[PDB]
């Protein structure tokens, strides 16, 4: 069953690829992250979004 | 979509408006550069593009109850601003249309109307004399105000013998404080050569003069100024030789 699986960030949308010698994979190096975005997410909460080119409010 | 709201963007400039009156394209018909079979001069022309390209604002008049209108002529208005007015002072030859965007907002409570217009041509005659036997002429400082612009003599007389109560042939808009609060005219290149001078011949005018007075009780706010942007499309140098000016 390969190695252990107790790193915190397990399970997570987010692709590592980690160096690691010991059983336990949370002593593993933060290692390289996968680069993933979404501002829209605090920047645009808005329930209707309307266009760049749009008047907001009509 | 909606008519009344409006935005312009030309170069580094930009210009955004919430009360206007649809854009006219002076005479149906947009800004272009000079073709090979109009154009004459043989030397290779220098197309700045957006740096002369943009909205210069030059003046912001005060539109007190009573006053007779002011005119600017055109381009004689930038020939001491920008890097346009460099290039224009620089070269023998130019070529360019406008974009002007004419500004003037009150509140609900005021009233009144302006009438923006682009006489081409735009040629002033002088009162002669007051008994018409005087063959006087204006001065440099009335032909060619510039920046400042140049108050009316007489508004119902064009200060040339023609009437304004026909002034909205050639492209004009009205600000009309109830309803709009902004004109934008578009000219093209209007005249009989592909190319002229930019400092001895004015292509045209703009006439900015109210129709309707200005009128408001005694509110909060009695200064009410009309501001004049514009945007030179489509320019054209050629001729290159010393700094001349005026």
Same mark, same amino acid.
Request: proline share 7%.
């Given at each position: 069953?390969?190695?252990?699986?107790?790193?915190?960030?397990?399970?997570?949308?987010?692709?590592?690829?980690?160096?690691?010698?010991?059983?336990?994979?949370?002593?593993?190096?933060?290692?390289?992250?996968?680069?993933?975005?979404?501002?829209?997410?605090?920047?645009?909460?808005?329930?209707?979004?309307?266009?760049?080119?749009?008047?907001?409010?009509? | 979509?909606?008519?009344?709201?409006?935005?312009?963007?030309?170069?580094?400039?930009?210009?955004?408006?919430?009360?206007?009156?649809?854009?006219?394209?002076?005479?149906?018909?947009?800004?272009?550069?000079?073709?090979?079979?109009?154009?004459?001069?043989?030397?290779?022309?220098?197309?700045?593009?957006?740096?002369?390209?943009?909205?210069?604002?030059?003046?912001?008049?005060?539109?007190?109850?009573?006053?007779?209108?002011?005119?600017?002529?055109? !381009?004689?208005?930038? %020939?001491?601003? $920008?890097?346009? #007015?460099?290039?224009? &002072?620089?070269? /023998?030859?130019?070529?360019? @249309?406008?974009?002007?965007?004419?500004?003037?907002?009150?509140?609900?409570?005021?009233?009144?109307?302006?009438?923006?217009?682009?006489?081409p041509?735009?040629?002033?005659?002088?009162?002669?004399?007051?008994?018409?036997?005087?063959?006087?002429?204006? !001065?440099?400082?009335? %032909?060619?105000? $510039?920046?400042? #612009?140049?108050?009316? &003599?007489?508004? /119902?007389?064009?200060?040339? @013998?023609?009437?304004?109560?026909?002034?909205?042939?050639?492209?004009?808009?009205?600000?009309?404080?109830?309803?709009?609060?902004?004109?934008?005219?578009?000219v093209?290149y209007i005249n009989?050569?592909?190319?002229?001078?930019?400092?001895?011949?004015?292509n045209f005018?703009?006439?900015?003069?109210?129709?309707?007075?200005?009128?408001?009780?005694?509110?909060?706010?009695?200064?009410?100024?009309?501001?004049?942007?514009?945007?030179?499309?489509?320019?054209?140098?050629?001729?290159?030789?010393?700094?001349?000016?005026?």
């Open positions: 069953s390969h190695e252990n699986s107790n790193s915190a960030t397990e399970g997570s949308t987010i692709n590592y690829t980690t160096i690691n010698y010991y059983k336990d994979s949370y002593a593993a190096t933060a290692g390289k992250q996968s680069l993933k975005q979404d501002p829209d997410k605090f920047a645009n909460p808005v329930k209707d979004i309307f266009t760049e080119m749009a008047a907001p409010l009509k | 979509y909606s008519d009344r709201v409006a935005q312009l963007t030309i170069g580094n400039s930009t210009i955004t408006t919430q009360e206007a009156a649809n854009i006219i394209v002076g005479y149906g018909e947009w800004p272009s550069y000079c073709s090979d079979s109009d154009a004459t001069a043989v030397d290779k022309p220098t197309r700045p593009d957006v740096s002369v390209n943009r909205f210069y604002t030059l003046d912001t008049k005060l539109w007190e109850k009573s006053s007779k209108g002011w005119y600017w002529k055109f !381009p004689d208005v930038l %020939t001491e601003t $920008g890097v346009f #007015g460099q290039n224009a &002072q620089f070269h /023998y030859l130019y070529r360019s @249309g406008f974009c002007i965007h004419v500004q003037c907002n009150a509140s609900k409570f005021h009233q009144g109307a302006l009438l923006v217009a682009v006489l041509e735009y040629v002033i005659g002088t009162v002669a004399g007051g008994t018409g036997t005087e063959d006087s002429h204006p !001065p440099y400082k009335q %032909t060619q105000p $510039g920046a400042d #612009g140049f108050e009316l &003599q007489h508004p /119902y007389v064009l200060d040339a @013998g023609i009437p304004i109560s026909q002034l909205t042939v050639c492209p004009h808009q009205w600000i009309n404080l109830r309803t709009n609060n902004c004109a934008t005219i578009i093209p009989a050569l592909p190319f002229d001078s930019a400092l001895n011949h004015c005018g703009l006439l900015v003069v109210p129709i309707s007075p200005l009128d408001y009780d005694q509110g909060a706010t009695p200064v009410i100024p009309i501001t004049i942007t514009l945007a030179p499309m489509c320019s054209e140098f050629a001729g290159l030789r010393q700094a001349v000016t005026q």
